[PDB]
């Protein structure tokens, strides 16, 4: 995703699913190659100690002054018609200048953005339609003209453009914070288990303090872990052995 040669236009933002792997987030948060690295509802360092069922890397390209629209509850052409984040987003936004790659003498027009739409996009909605936008009361019937405009427009990416207008590559990492089996964990190592003692335990990011004992609960093959009345954990399933 980050080393991808070619990025998708913001209106047709690419999505890459990450599953069943170890995520060494250091390679990102220790790198100096990024201008914007903004994580909402999460700190990247702690991601080394966390598991998830899925991660989604949404990749695209915009101009610099629109990077601010990549954030929860923002407005504008991008956040409205191209790529909308939810207000309760939990994940990271990474953006870095790509003038050396996406801009050329004479202007690179391969990257587009949607200029018109009858309504704002819902979070993580993807609209790739090229329907003629009916600005007026007259049906267009797929014919451009007065009050009938093509919904997309190219970015003018020249190397001499202002940093505000220069191309920036954007990657959006979203985590599947669900109660289900997790296949995306961090590089943190595991240790041996100690029973019948007061310990500070961490099971797949579920942290706590208590005494772990062999249970007699009739857990089902799928049950990840149990709770008591107070919505608190009462029994767990060892990630390493059943």
């Amino acid at each position: 995703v980050f080393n991808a040669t070619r990025f998708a236009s913001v209106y047709a933002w690419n999505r890459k699913r990450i599953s069943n792997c170890v995520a060494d987030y250091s390679v990102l948060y220790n790198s100096a190659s990024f201008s914007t690295f903004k994580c909402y509802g999460v700190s990247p360092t702690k991601l080394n100690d966390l598991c998830f069922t899925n991660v989604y890397a949404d990749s695209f390209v915009i101009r610099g002054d629109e990077v601010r629209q990549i954030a929860p509850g923002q407005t504008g052409k991008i956040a409205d018609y191209n790529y909308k984040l939810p207000d309760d987003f939990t994940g990271c936004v990474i953006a870095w200048n790509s003038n050396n790659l996406d801009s050329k003498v004479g202007g690179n027009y391969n990257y587009l953005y949607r200029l018109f739409r009858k309504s704002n996009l819902k979070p993580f909605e993807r609209d790739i339609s090229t329907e003629i936008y009916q600005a007026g009361s007259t049906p267009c019937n797929g014919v451009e003209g007065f009050n009938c405009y093509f919904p997309l427009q190219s970015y003018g990416f020249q190397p001499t453009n202002g940093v505000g207008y220069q191309p920036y590559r954007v990657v959006v990492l979203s985590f599947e914070l669900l109660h289900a089996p997790a296949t995306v964990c961090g590089p943190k190592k595991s240790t041996n288990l100690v029973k019948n003692k007061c310990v500070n335990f961490n099971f797949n990011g579920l942290t706590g303090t208590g005494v772990l004992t062999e249970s007699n609960k009739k857990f089902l093959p799928f049950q990840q872990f149990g709770r008591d009345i107070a919505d608190t954990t009462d029994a767990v399933r060892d990630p390493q052995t059943l």
Partner: nanobody
Framework: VQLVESGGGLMQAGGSLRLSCAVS????????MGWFRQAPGKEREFVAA????????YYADSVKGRFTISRDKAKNTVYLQMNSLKYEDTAVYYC????????????????????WGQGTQVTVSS
């Protein structure tokens, strides 16, 4: 990337000719194709444009109701059907291509295009 024109040549007034322009070589994307013409001693002049997506067409006033621009995406070819030929249509006709996507089709009349064909002579006789 090359634009290869064909067709045209000599035709008597009132007749019809078709020009072709085939795009060869690796393209990332095509926004629009256009036809221009240059009569001897005169400035090169817009004739017609077509958006690659959707196929909406824009015409110079001088050719409306006479010329039709069309596209075959699979053949990466643009056509100009030149009906009701007049002496004033005598010119070298040039194919043009751009990757610039404007929301506004009429922009293709005045947009500087990136790629140009070699030009094909059309001569209208009596």
């Amino acid at each position: 990337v090359q634009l290869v024109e064909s067709g045209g040549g000599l035709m008597q007034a009132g007749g019809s000719l078709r020009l072709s322009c085939a795009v060869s070589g690796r393209t990332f994307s095509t926004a629009a194709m256009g036809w221009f013409r240059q009569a001897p001693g005169k400035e090169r002049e817009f004739v017609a444009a077509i958006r690659w997506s959707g196929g909406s067409a824009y015409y110079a006033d001088s050719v409306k109701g006479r010329f039709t621009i069309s596209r075959d995406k699979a053949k990466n070819t643009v056509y100009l059907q030149m009906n009701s030929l007049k002496y004033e249509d005598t010119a070298v006709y040039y194919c043009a291509r751009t990757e610039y996507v404007s929301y506004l089709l009429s922009d293709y009349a005045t947009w500087p295009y990136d790629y140009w064909g070699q030009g094909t002579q059309v001569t209208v006789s009596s």
